[PDB]
Enzyme design. Structure first.
Site, PDB file in Angstrom:
ATOM      1  N   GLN C  11      -2.788  -0.153  -7.545  1.00 32.94           N
ATOM      2  CA  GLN C  11      -4.209   0.549  -7.057  1.00 32.94           C
ATOM      3  C   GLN C  11      -4.533  -0.467  -5.845  1.00 32.94           C
ATOM      4  OE1 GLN C  11      -6.855   1.144 -10.289  1.00 32.94           O
ATOM      5  NE2 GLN C  11      -8.519   1.528  -9.043  1.00 32.94           N
ATOM      6  N   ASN C 218     -12.666  -3.889   0.599  1.00 33.21           N
ATOM      7  CA  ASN C 218     -11.627  -3.715   1.247  1.00 33.21           C
ATOM      8  C   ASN C 218     -11.889  -3.740   2.978  1.00 33.21           C
ATOM      9  OD1 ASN C 218     -10.744  -3.307  -1.178  1.00 33.21           O
ATOM     10  ND2 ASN C 218      -9.725  -1.428  -0.828  1.00 33.21           N
ATOM     11  N   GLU C 244       4.596 -19.117  14.450  1.00 32.70           N
ATOM     12  CA  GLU C 244       3.521 -20.290  15.039  1.00 32.70           C
ATOM     13  C   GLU C 244       2.580 -20.690  13.845  1.00 32.70           C
ATOM     14  OE1 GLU C 244       1.096 -19.767  18.393  1.00 32.70           O
ATOM     15  OE2 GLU C 244       2.157 -21.487  19.499  1.00 32.70           O
TER      16      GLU C 244
HETATM   17  N1  GTP Z   1      -9.673  -6.155  -4.100  1.00 35.29           N
HETATM   18  C1  GTP Z   1      -9.138  -5.018  -4.753  1.00 35.29           C
HETATM   19  N2  GTP Z   1      -8.773  -5.405  -6.137  1.00 35.29           N
HETATM   20  C2  GTP Z   1      -8.269  -4.232  -6.715  1.00 35.29           C
HETATM   21  C3  GTP Z   1      -8.320  -2.747  -6.138  1.00 35.29           C
HETATM   22  N3  GTP Z   1      -8.069  -1.913  -7.289  1.00 35.29           N
HETATM   23  C4  GTP Z   1      -7.720  -2.699  -8.290  1.00 35.29           C
HETATM   24  N4  GTP Z   1      -7.707  -4.057  -7.994  1.00 35.29           N
HETATM   25  C5  GTP Z   1      -7.442  -5.058  -8.817  1.00 35.29           C
HETATM   26  O1  GTP Z   1      -6.195  -4.712  -9.485  1.00 35.29           O
HETATM   27  C6  GTP Z   1      -6.344  -5.054 -10.968  1.00 35.29           C
HETATM   28  C7  GTP Z   1      -5.530  -4.196 -12.034  1.00 35.29           C
HETATM   29  O2  GTP Z   1      -4.453  -3.734 -11.298  1.00 35.29           O
HETATM   30  P1  GTP Z   1      -4.619  -2.226 -10.396  1.00 35.29           P
HETATM   31  O3  GTP Z   1      -4.508  -2.519  -8.960  1.00 35.29           O
HETATM   32  O4  GTP Z   1      -5.788  -1.653 -10.982  1.00 35.29           O
HETATM   33  O5  GTP Z   1      -3.157  -1.472 -11.092  1.00 35.29           O
HETATM   34  P2  GTP Z   1      -1.719  -2.173 -10.567  1.00 35.29           P
HETATM   35  O6  GTP Z   1      -1.599  -3.231  -9.565  1.00 35.29           O
HETATM   36  O7  GTP Z   1      -0.880  -0.771 -10.086  1.00 35.29           O
HETATM   37  O8  GTP Z   1      -1.297  -2.472 -12.066  1.00 35.29           O
HETATM   38  P3  GTP Z   1      -1.268  -1.560 -13.497  1.00 35.29           P
HETATM   39  O9  GTP Z   1      -2.781  -1.586 -13.564  1.00 35.29           O
HETATM   40  O10 GTP Z   1      -0.590  -2.216 -14.478  1.00 35.29           O
HETATM   41  O11 GTP Z   1      -0.469  -0.366 -13.076  1.00 35.29           O
HETATM   42  C8  GTP Z   1      -7.877  -5.349 -11.474  1.00 35.29           C
HETATM   43  O12 GTP Z   1      -8.273  -6.223 -12.015  1.00 35.29           O
HETATM   44  C9  GTP Z   1      -8.426  -5.208  -9.928  1.00 35.29           C
HETATM   45  O13 GTP Z   1      -9.120  -6.456  -9.660  1.00 35.29           O
HETATM   46  C10 GTP Z   1      -8.993  -2.750  -5.056  1.00 35.29           C
HETATM   47  O14 GTP Z   1      -9.092  -1.620  -4.649  1.00 35.29           O
HETATM   48  N5  GTP Z   1      -9.403  -3.655  -4.330  1.00 35.29           N
HETATM   49 MG    MG Z   2      -2.364  -0.029 -12.120  1.00 34.58          MG
END
Ligand code: GTP
Ligand code: MG
Ligand code: GDP
Ligand code: GDP
Lengths: 118, 426, 426, 426
Positions: C11, C218, C244
């Protein structure tokens, strides 16, 4: 044992009850604007080339669905669609003026070199 | 060109074929006068499969009605499509069999064969290229179970290469209305195994079961049951009468569903059975038809395929679809219910598609298959036939007709040998 | 010709990639369709004269990518590039590494293989994910593991969310975080660890927006990646490539964790009232209260500093600022780096999105210091994971998934050894 | 994709689900007929989670209603949303249990276990990828408390990996309606601990408490009580049905809610409950949401969490917010009342965001929490069950159905061991 001589008329009583409670579908054909499944015809079958009219509102439905959110909704709905909402550049992109907008896109002999790398 | 003549024996056969000609005349757009009132060109291109041309644009069914009792035909002539038939094709006796198989096969049989064999000869010579004959009757009768065995015995000698089909009605043990009903069926199946290319084992008892659960009709008459079979023989011949994406005929099905000549007893099915309350809650999809069919409640005979192995299965479809969901649901059901299919035949199932839907409906599907569950039917009859025959009960009625006591023994040996090798193939 | 391929996972990967790609499109003038009414390092031309983003969005949940599929840039993006799964790991590294990965490992590998086939000379693989999500953790781990043997020499930049020391969106995050570090140790070239809380504090303090969101974060992530890639995209007096500034950042194979900083970051209303010049911006890059990782470099010692100016800037002012920052006792350097700066300059000022937050500013600076002050965050995570594993909470989930429980202690010991190595440098 | 099947048991369950299906149909813009009359596109983007497609643009409930008495079924059919359910999904038996756990679980259960299993199976094979089933029932009945356990035991063998939530209604000691209530409760929790991934403890006495004070309703009917629990579970799966800034689903919290498999009992909490006199004088804010959220009077169970330690906390937000307030209010709570949280789990709180507000409302949240206070209920059950069992009173009802005596002994042993390992975790 199952006393079907009684059971069947209990079911008949029930069938009459939801017959009284039965309401017809009100003829509001809705269809999902996501996608529909179709079947290709036989181009030669002397029944398949039959001329038959189409629908006029379904085309408007697709031409409205397959389009971005900005012209769909006057105001935003989700925070995922705030992003890139206004693509209007506040100043004109004078991207022809090398004076203030210098670009390193490939130029001159480097294009031929990109060809030569292959 | 490709013609089929319909033989009509017995009160059960007479009423079934009467409604059978009714529905297909609706399918071909024929009025009770006999002319054509249909709309599509395709409605009249292959109408000569079942009908013969008459002057003034009238069509007559290519059928022969036989019954030893004159009473039944008067109801037939008084029906809605009653005057449609040619009067000369009506052949009948003066005295019935009294539900006695021996009276009809032997005693009262020799007089009425000469007339009916003449009429079928004229209809056979009328057509240039006949596919074969079809007969509708019941195995618990005196005429259909009785006379009807001698007709097929003779016409096999006259026309060996032509295919014949019989939609015979097998009596049920749970509901019976004849003492000597096992006796007639004992002496009828022996004639069926020797001379029949395919048999459609229909049963009345499952027919009342279906309208009680699947259709939920409060007072099911004989017409609704005759309507259910009427859809079944219509679904057999829709691909013959009408073109499709993948065409087929009866010989397409006869060759591909008989692994060995002794086995020609099959299980018919016909898919779109929904009660009135079920019309509201459904989505007309190819998977919905397949799930409805492979469930045993849909079946119109008296034995469960879950207790046997599906030797051969065939699924003929009516309507315009695409074959992938036809093929994938075909592949899905083959893999899932692997134990119910035999191993010595991979790809146990056969498909066919006819573009034109049944009248007033969008989708209809017909299944014709061979399963080991049909041996449950024969052994149940032997459980009764031996019980009557051990005490020589109800024997003088047959013995008065002049045949020996050996004929019961040779017959009883025959399906016992049949269910033996049928059990061996399981 | 220099090319950087995006391999965004999760995500976070999807949202960050959509951010970075709107900044790339507005930078290169590409309309939302993908038509121009520099670019080649990220886009690629097609037969139709469109420009194709070189991004691979991969996720285990459909909806996160279907939001993009129905977003504005749907025709800009490739249906095949967007790779989705049906069922997620749900914050489970074991699910993400052993049970659900292998279903689409091949598909993701084939997608990046065709993208590398399209590219001629590949500069780098920019890979974005998180240390909290089971998807962004285990899938990132396995794709690093296979990508290392697929391309031995091609550089792999690792931008990833690290769990914040105070706030957290998960309870089972530290298990995934400790189990993931093996891949960022032995299968990564640079790592750009980020916690949300630091950016939260920055955007509240400097940017005056009391209620920001993930897209506000973002925006700054896209800004820093764009400033990293600006030297490749456009001309500069001292262009800086990936090779570099990795060479002048990584002293040993085990130390590839620099901390980043962007300056200036002020809203327009306050931007009205101050001069923005090289000295002030490079002093703002050094404040511990502006650091995008929750640690104080004043508690550690800098041993490398990569430097990327941008916009209207003169190397005279660059050298003056370098002298000024070197003449400061609060800023320490390790004894084996009398000269620890890697300076680069680019001409084009950072562009601005409408609806963003930063004002348009003629000169900007991006700082990348490798120091020893980062190990305290790993120490906090070590304490938290130790008091996790003491009572063996949530262990049953991973064990049922099917990994060996000794790997937990192995990862704990490995991160302890990494902290010990950082002590040896310090 | 991610589909939910709503298994329904008991009069309490039948009335709860009927109101539960009304709000979602109202939430998804579904009329009593079954069509769609709403406005937003996102109202039908994940509609098929709970609904199945039927022809004519019809969406049918994926619910299986089970009861041992015909009297409930006419009432649910007679409701405004009464005809919307599929009649074939309706399953019932002719004779009830009379609030006897033994009759429903063993005697009359074995005759209806088969038919419901086919109905759920057809709904199981309908959806391509199912996340897991769903059951609402009562622990004081004869079918939901009795029979209802047998469904869960069977489907875990058939479908082990799928998620299993049960919204079991726990009888109250202050307000009870059945003399044999403790016997059913004692013999159900043992089935509940062994085969259940998560349980939601709902008590009607606390439901009576809130409408007395929070809503100040003069005449609270059982429909109002069903309105809260339907509103509770609508907040559980709103993140599943609608995208958000930070997404989640049932597997997201369940992995994050279960440190050890023996615990799966959680405390439901709903935010936006205000009386008629509270609407005029309020400012709808996230801090105003959180202050009522933690208050021990808002809870709908018979336990005070201030007497125990909060193991894990979930707060799923529905609507549009900024997480900075959400993060700061979670952080503020986690620091002030520090004694009520465990020390071996820092950051006990898990949060999620669903962008779509509930229909008719703007701000809402749902609370799911595991605290030490749930053992206050089981021990309160124990002081009655032992007070029922020592003199063998009301035992001939249970002994006559065919079981022996040690089943009660193993039931109390398991709950005593359960509370014993649960006190040790305090
Ligand atoms: N900076 C930032 N962090 C994000 C964002 N979306 C999710 N996260 C981080 O990702 C963590 C959870 O993982 P997700 O990205 O939501 O989902 P995933 O990486 O696909 O992993 P799963 O939830 O197990 O499917 C959260 O604790 C957030 O801190 C985003 O749009 N920006
Ligand atoms: Mg996820
Ligand atoms: N399915 C069906 N069966 C029928 C119908 N009419 C009669 N039968 C069956 O036919 C049997 C009697 O057949 P019968 O008149 O003696 O046949 P016949 O001796 O050949 O004339 C009864 O057991 C009925 O079950 C009908 O319309 N439909
Ligand atoms: N909260 C709530 N509880 C209900 C409702 N209807 C019934 N109950 C409870 O359900 C219990 C009776 O359940 P019962 O009908 O015996 O369950 P069954 O044996 O499984 O059918 C009573 O103690 C009620 O408290 C309702 O609408 N809401």
């Amino acid at each position: 044992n199952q006393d079907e001589v009684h059971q069947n008329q209990i079911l008949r009583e029930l069938f009459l009850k939801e017959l009284r409670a039965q309401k017809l579908y009100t003829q509001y054909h809705v269809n999902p604007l996501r996608k529909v499944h179709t079947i290709t015809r036989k181009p030669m079958s002397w029944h398949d080339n039959l001329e038959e009219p189409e629908d006029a509102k379904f085309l408007n439905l697709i031409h409205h669905a397959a389009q971005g959110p900005k012209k769909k909704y006057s105001e935003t709905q989700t925070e995922a669609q705030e992003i890139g909402w206004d693509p209007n550049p506040l100043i004109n992109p004078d991207r022809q003026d090398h004076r203030l907008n210098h670009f390193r896109v490939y130029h001159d002999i480097t294009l031929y070199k990109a060809k030569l790398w292959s | 060109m490709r013609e089929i003549v319909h033989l009509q024996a017995g009160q059960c056969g007479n009423q079934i074929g009467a409604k059978f000609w009714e529905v297909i005349s609706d399918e071909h757009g024929i009025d009770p006068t006999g002319t054509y009132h249909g709309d599509s060109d395709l409605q009249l291109e292959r109408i000569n499969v079942y009908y013969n041309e008459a002057t003034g644009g009238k069509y007559v069914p290519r059928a022969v009605l036989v019954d030893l009792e004159p009473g039944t035909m008067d109801s037939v002539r008084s029906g809605p499509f009653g005057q449609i038939f040619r009067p000369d094709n009506f052949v009948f006796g003066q005295s019935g069999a009294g539900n006695n198989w021996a009276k009809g096969h032997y005693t009262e049989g020799a007089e009425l064969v000469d007339s009916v064999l003449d009429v079928v000869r004229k209809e056979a010579e009328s057509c240039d290229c006949l596919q074969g004959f079809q007969l509708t009757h019941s195995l618990g009768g005196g005429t259909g179970s009785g006379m009807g065995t001698l007709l097929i015995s003779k016409i096999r000698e006259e026309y060996p290469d032509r295919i014949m089909n019989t939609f015979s009605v097998v009596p049920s043990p749970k509901v019976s209305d004849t003492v000597v009903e096992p006796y007639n069926a004992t002496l009828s199946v022996h004639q069926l195994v020797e001379n029949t290319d395919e048999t459609y084992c229909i049963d009345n008892e499952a027919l009342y079961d279906i309208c009680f659960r699947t259709l939920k009709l409060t007072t099911p008459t004989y017409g609704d049951l005759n309507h259910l079979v009427s859809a079944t023989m219509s679904g057999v011949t829709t691909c013959l009468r009408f073109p499709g994406q993948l065409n087929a005929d009866l010989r397409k099905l006869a060759v591909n569903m008989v692994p060995f000549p002794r086995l020609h007893f099959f299980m018919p099915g016909f898919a779109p059975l929904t009660s009135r309350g079920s019309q509201q809650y459904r989505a007309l999809t190819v998977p919905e038809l397949t799930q409805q069919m492979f469930d045993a409640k849909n079946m119109m005979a008296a034995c469960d395929p879950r207790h046997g192995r599906y030797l051969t299965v065939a699924a003929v479809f009516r309507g315009r679809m695409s074959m992938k969901e036809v093929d994938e649901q075909m592949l899905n059901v083959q893999n899932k219910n692997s134990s119910y299919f035999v191993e010595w035949i991979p790809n146990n199932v056969k498909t066919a598609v006819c573009d034109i839907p049944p009248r007033g409906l969008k989708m209809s599907a017909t299944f014709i298959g061979n399963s080991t569950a049909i041996q449950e039917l024969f052994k149940r009859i032997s459980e009764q036939f031996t019980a009557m025959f051990r005490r020589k009960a109800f024997l003088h009625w047959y013995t008065g007709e002049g045949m020996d006591e050996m004929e019961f023994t040779e017959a009883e040996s025959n399906m016992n040998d049949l269910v033996s090798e049928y059990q061996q193939y399981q | 010709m220099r090319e950087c391929i995006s391999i965004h996972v999760g995500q976070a990967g999807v949202q960050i990639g959509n951010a970075c790609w709107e900044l790339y499109c507005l930078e290169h003038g590409i309309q939302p369709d993908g038509q121009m009414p520099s670019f080649n390092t990220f886009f690629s031309e097609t037969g139709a004269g469109k420009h194709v983003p070189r991004a691979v969005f991969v996720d285990l949940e459909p909806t996160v990518v279907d939001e993009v599929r129905t977003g504005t840039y749907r025709q800009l993006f490739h249906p095949e590039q967007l790779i989705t799964g049906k069922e997620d790991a749900a914050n489970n590294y074991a699910r993400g590494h052993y049970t659900i990965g292998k279903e689409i490992v091949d598909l993701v590998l084939d997608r990046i293989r065709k993208l590398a086939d399209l590219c001629t000379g590949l500069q780098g693989f920019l890979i974005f994910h998180s240390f909290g999500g089971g998807t962004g953790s285990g899938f990132a781990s396995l794709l690093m593991e296979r990508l290392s043997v697929d391309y031995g020499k091609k550089s792999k930049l690792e931008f990833a969310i690290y769990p914040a020391p105070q706030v957290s969106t998960a309870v089972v995050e530290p298990y995934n975080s400790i189990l993931t570090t093996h891949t960022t140790l032995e299968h990564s070239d640079c790592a750009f660890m980020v916690d949300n809380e630091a950016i939260y504090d920055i955007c509240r303090r400097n940017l005056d927006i009391e209620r920001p969101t993930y897209t506000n974060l973002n925006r700054l992530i896209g800004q820093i990646v764009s400033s990293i890639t600006a030297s490749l995209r456009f001309d500069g007096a001292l262009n800086v490539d990936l090779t570099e500034f990795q060479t002048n950042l990584v002293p040993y194979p085990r130390i590839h964790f620099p901390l980043a900083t962007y300056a200036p970051v002020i809203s327009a209303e306050k931007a009205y009232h101050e001069q923005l010049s090289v000295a002030e911006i490079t002093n703002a890059c050094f404040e511990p209260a502006n650091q995008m990782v929750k640690c104080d470099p004043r508690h550690g010692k800098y041993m490398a500093c990569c430097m990327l100016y941008r916009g209207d800037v003169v190397p005279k002012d660059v050298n003056a600022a370098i002298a000024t920052i070197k003449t400061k006792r609060t800023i320490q350097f390790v004894d084996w780096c009398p000269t620890g700066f890697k300076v680069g300059i680019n001409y084009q000022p950072p562009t601005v999105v409408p609806g963003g937050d930063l004002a348009k500013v003629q000169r900007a600076v991006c700082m990348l210091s490798n120091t020893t002050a980062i190990a305290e965050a790993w120490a906090r995570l070590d304490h938290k994971f130790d008091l996790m594993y003491a009572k063996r909470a949530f262990v049953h989930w991973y064990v049922g998934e099917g990994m060996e429980e000794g790997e937990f202690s192995e990862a704990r010991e490995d991160l302890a050894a990494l902290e010990k190595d950082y002590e040896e440098v310090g």
